[PDB]
Design a protein around this motif. Sequence first.
Motif, PDB file in Angstrom:
ATOM      1  N   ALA A 155       0.856  -1.185   0.000  1.00 39.01           N
ATOM      2  CA  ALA A 155       0.000   0.000   0.000  1.00 39.01           C
ATOM      3  C   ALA A 155       0.901   1.248   0.000  1.00 39.01           C
ATOM      4  O   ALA A 155       1.863   1.302   0.756  1.00 39.01           O
ATOM      5  CB  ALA A 155      -0.888  -0.005   1.232  1.00 39.01           C
ATOM      6  N   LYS A 156       0.604   2.231  -0.838  1.00 37.81           N
ATOM      7  CA  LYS A 156       1.450   3.420  -0.987  1.00 37.81           C
ATOM      8  C   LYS A 156       0.618   4.708  -1.153  1.00 37.81           C
ATOM      9  O   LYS A 156      -0.301   4.734  -1.970  1.00 37.81           O
ATOM     10  CB  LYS A 156       2.320   3.173  -2.232  1.00 37.81           C
ATOM     11  CG  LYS A 156       3.417   4.162  -2.589  1.00 37.81           C
ATOM     12  CD  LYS A 156       3.987   3.809  -3.994  1.00 37.81           C
ATOM     13  CE  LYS A 156       2.898   3.322  -4.964  1.00 37.81           C
ATOM     14  NZ  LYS A 156       3.345   3.268  -6.384  1.00 37.81           N
ATOM     15  N   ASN A 157       0.896   5.745  -0.352  1.00 36.14           N
ATOM     16  CA  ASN A 157       0.163   7.013  -0.454  1.00 36.14           C
ATOM     17  C   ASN A 157       0.762   7.881  -1.563  1.00 36.14           C
ATOM     18  O   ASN A 157       1.981   7.995  -1.657  1.00 36.14           O
ATOM     19  CB  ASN A 157       0.167   7.797   0.870  1.00 36.14           C
ATOM     20  CG  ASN A 157      -0.659   7.176   1.971  1.00 36.14           C
ATOM     21  OD1 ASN A 157      -0.349   6.096   2.458  1.00 36.14           O
ATOM     22  ND2 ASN A 157      -1.715   7.852   2.411  1.00 36.14           N
ATOM     23  N   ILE A 158      -0.081   8.465  -2.423  1.00 39.39           N
ATOM     24  CA  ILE A 158       0.391   9.304  -3.523  1.00 39.39           C
ATOM     25  C   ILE A 158      -0.400  10.589  -3.505  1.00 39.39           C
ATOM     26  O   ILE A 158      -1.610  10.548  -3.651  1.00 39.39           O
ATOM     27  CB  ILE A 158       0.163   8.605  -4.869  1.00 39.39           C
ATOM     28  CG1 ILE A 158       0.728   7.166  -4.882  1.00 39.39           C
ATOM     29  CG2 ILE A 158       0.693   9.469  -6.014  1.00 39.39           C
ATOM     30  CD1 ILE A 158       2.244   7.054  -4.918  1.00 39.39           C
ATOM     31  N   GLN A 159       0.261  11.716  -3.330  1.00 39.41           N
ATOM     32  CA  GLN A 159      -0.393  13.008  -3.244  1.00 39.41           C
ATOM     33  C   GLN A 159      -0.558  13.641  -4.620  1.00 39.41           C
ATOM     34  O   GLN A 159       0.370  13.621  -5.428  1.00 39.41           O
ATOM     35  CB  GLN A 159       0.403  13.923  -2.306  1.00 39.41           C
ATOM     36  CG  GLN A 159      -0.313  15.221  -1.970  1.00 39.41           C
ATOM     37  CD  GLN A 159       0.172  15.791  -0.670  1.00 39.41           C
ATOM     38  OE1 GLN A 159       0.600  15.070   0.249  1.00 39.41           O
ATOM     39  NE2 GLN A 159       0.122  17.107  -0.572  1.00 39.41           N
ATOM     40  N   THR A 160      -1.747  14.198  -4.894  1.00 34.94           N
ATOM     41  CA  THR A 160      -2.046  14.805  -6.182  1.00 34.94           C
ATOM     42  C   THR A 160      -3.092  15.923  -6.031  1.00 34.94           C
ATOM     43  O   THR A 160      -3.809  15.962  -5.028  1.00 34.94           O
ATOM     44  CB  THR A 160      -2.547  13.690  -7.147  1.00 34.94           C
ATOM     45  OG1 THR A 160      -2.518  14.141  -8.507  1.00 34.94           O
ATOM     46  CG2 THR A 160      -3.933  13.151  -6.774  1.00 34.94           C
ATOM     47  N   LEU A 161      -3.199  16.816  -7.023  1.00 35.26           N
ATOM     48  CA  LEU A 161      -4.257  17.817  -7.014  1.00 35.26           C
ATOM     49  C   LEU A 161      -5.258  17.314  -8.045  1.00 35.26           C
ATOM     50  O   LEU A 161      -4.922  17.162  -9.227  1.00 35.26           O
ATOM     51  CB  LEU A 161      -3.786  19.243  -7.390  1.00 35.26           C
ATOM     52  CG  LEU A 161      -4.932  20.243  -7.525  1.00 35.26           C
ATOM     53  CD1 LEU A 161      -5.477  20.653  -6.181  1.00 35.26           C
ATOM     54  CD2 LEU A 161      -4.544  21.430  -8.344  1.00 35.26           C
ATOM     55  N   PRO A 162      -6.503  17.061  -7.620  1.00 39.03           N
ATOM     56  CA  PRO A 162      -7.504  16.569  -8.574  1.00 39.03           C
ATOM     57  C   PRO A 162      -7.882  17.576  -9.653  1.00 39.03           C
ATOM     58  O   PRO A 162      -7.867  18.789  -9.445  1.00 39.03           O
ATOM     59  CB  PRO A 162      -8.723  16.274  -7.692  1.00 39.03           C
ATOM     60  CG  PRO A 162      -8.190  16.181  -6.295  1.00 39.03           C
ATOM     61  CD  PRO A 162      -7.050  17.157  -6.255  1.00 39.03           C
ATOM     62  N   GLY A 163      -8.235  17.031 -10.804  1.00 39.80           N
ATOM     63  CA  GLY A 163      -8.839  17.733 -11.913  1.00 39.80           C
ATOM     64  C   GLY A 163     -10.348  17.728 -11.718  1.00 39.80           C
ATOM     65  O   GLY A 163     -10.829  17.592 -10.586  1.00 39.80           O
ATOM     66  N   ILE A 164     -11.113  17.874 -12.817  1.00 36.45           N
ATOM     67  CA  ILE A 164     -12.581  17.945 -12.801  1.00 36.45           C
ATOM     68  C   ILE A 164     -13.190  17.133 -13.950  1.00 36.45           C
ATOM     69  O   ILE A 164     -12.707  17.188 -15.079  1.00 36.45           O
ATOM     70  CB  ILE A 164     -13.065  19.436 -12.979  1.00 36.45           C
ATOM     71  CG1 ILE A 164     -12.529  20.395 -11.901  1.00 36.45           C
ATOM     72  CG2 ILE A 164     -14.588  19.548 -13.085  1.00 36.45           C
ATOM     73  CD1 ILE A 164     -13.045  20.154 -10.561  1.00 36.45           C
ATOM     74  N   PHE A 165     -14.302  16.456 -13.684  1.00 34.52           N
ATOM     75  CA  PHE A 165     -15.126  15.800 -14.682  1.00 34.52           C
ATOM     76  C   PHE A 165     -16.331  16.733 -14.761  1.00 34.52           C
ATOM     77  O   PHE A 165     -17.011  16.925 -13.749  1.00 34.52           O
ATOM     78  CB  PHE A 165     -15.605  14.422 -14.184  1.00 34.52           C
ATOM     79  CG  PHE A 165     -14.780  13.224 -14.591  1.00 34.52           C
ATOM     80  CD1 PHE A 165     -13.503  13.381 -15.118  1.00 34.52           C
ATOM     81  CD2 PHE A 165     -15.259  11.939 -14.404  1.00 34.52           C
ATOM     82  CE1 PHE A 165     -12.736  12.279 -15.462  1.00 34.52           C
ATOM     83  CE2 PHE A 165     -14.489  10.836 -14.757  1.00 34.52           C
ATOM     84  CZ  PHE A 165     -13.241  11.014 -15.290  1.00 34.52           C
ATOM     85  N   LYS A 166     -16.574  17.357 -15.917  1.00 35.53           N
ATOM     86  CA  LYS A 166     -17.724  18.235 -16.079  1.00 35.53           C
ATOM     87  C   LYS A 166     -18.831  17.425 -16.718  1.00 35.53           C
ATOM     88  O   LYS A 166     -18.683  16.962 -17.847  1.00 35.53           O
ATOM     89  CB  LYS A 166     -17.373  19.479 -16.934  1.00 35.53           C
ATOM     90  CG  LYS A 166     -16.386  20.422 -16.245  1.00 35.53           C
ATOM     91  CD  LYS A 166     -16.069  21.674 -17.087  1.00 35.53           C
ATOM     92  CE  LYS A 166     -15.327  22.728 -16.285  1.00 35.53           C
ATOM     93  NZ  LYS A 166     -14.760  23.833 -17.129  1.00 35.53           N
ATOM     94  N   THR A 167     -19.927  17.206 -15.986  1.00 28.85           N
ATOM     95  CA  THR A 167     -21.053  16.428 -16.512  1.00 28.85           C
ATOM     96  C   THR A 167     -22.318  17.306 -16.649  1.00 28.85           C
ATOM     97  O   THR A 167     -22.348  18.422 -16.134  1.00 28.85           O
ATOM     98  CB  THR A 167     -21.297  15.118 -15.678  1.00 28.85           C
ATOM     99  OG1 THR A 167     -22.152  15.381 -14.564  1.00 28.85           O
ATOM    100  CG2 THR A 167     -20.009  14.445 -15.204  1.00 28.85           C
TER     101      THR A 167
END
Lengths: 156, 39
Positions: free
Chosen positions: A91-103
């Motif tokens: 198990a490994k933690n990975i930090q990221t800034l989310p994008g967006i799904f425009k629905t």
Amino acid sequence: GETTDGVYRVMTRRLLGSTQVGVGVMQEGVFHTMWHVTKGAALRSGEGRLDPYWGDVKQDLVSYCGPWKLDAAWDGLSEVQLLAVPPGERAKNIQTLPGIFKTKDGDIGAVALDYPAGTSGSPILDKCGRVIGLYGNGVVIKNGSYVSAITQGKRE
Amino acid sequence: DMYIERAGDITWEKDAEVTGNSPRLDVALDESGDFSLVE
Ligand SMILES: NCc1cccc(NC(=O)c2cc(Cl)cc(NC(=O)OCc3ccccc3)c2)c1
């Protein structure tokens, strides 16, 4: 069997050896995963049985032993961590800034991290360690990369 | 028959590996729970 809170691997022995089909979160006695991982089937934990309680193919979610308990949401601004549990790896933690799904029904958070399909169900966490959704349902973009939705259920 | 195996605790880790980008994409979700790119 084991009902301790935490992240779990979902395994099967029907194919060659023991194969990891996905991942889930155990919280408040309820096991949470993606529908495409188990197809709603019963799960074993030691010699105990986990029976499905709620599920929905369109949301691609399923809960076991009780109703969906995860209600935290991405705040729209902050970085998050994917607690990736890949097949045969730690198990490994990975930090990221989310994008967006425009629905047509609103915007949803999206994480652009690439992992084997058997990593489906790995939890996405906020800075407080709260599960804001699961990884494993998304789209394939031009560069063959994968962008998963931050899929969250509703706590009734 | 499927079974579960514990893999760890659910915690935020300070100084974790930072990677991944933030794309904004027009998407659609069908009755089967499949996402697709709206183009
Ligand atoms: N709608 C539910 C659903 C059904 C079945 C499957 C799925 N989920 C996925 O397919 C899925 C889930 C994850 Cl966690 C990662 C990926 N990754 C992915 O496709 O990466 C590109 C790639 C492919 C092959 C070799 C190298 C790269 C897919 C959802």
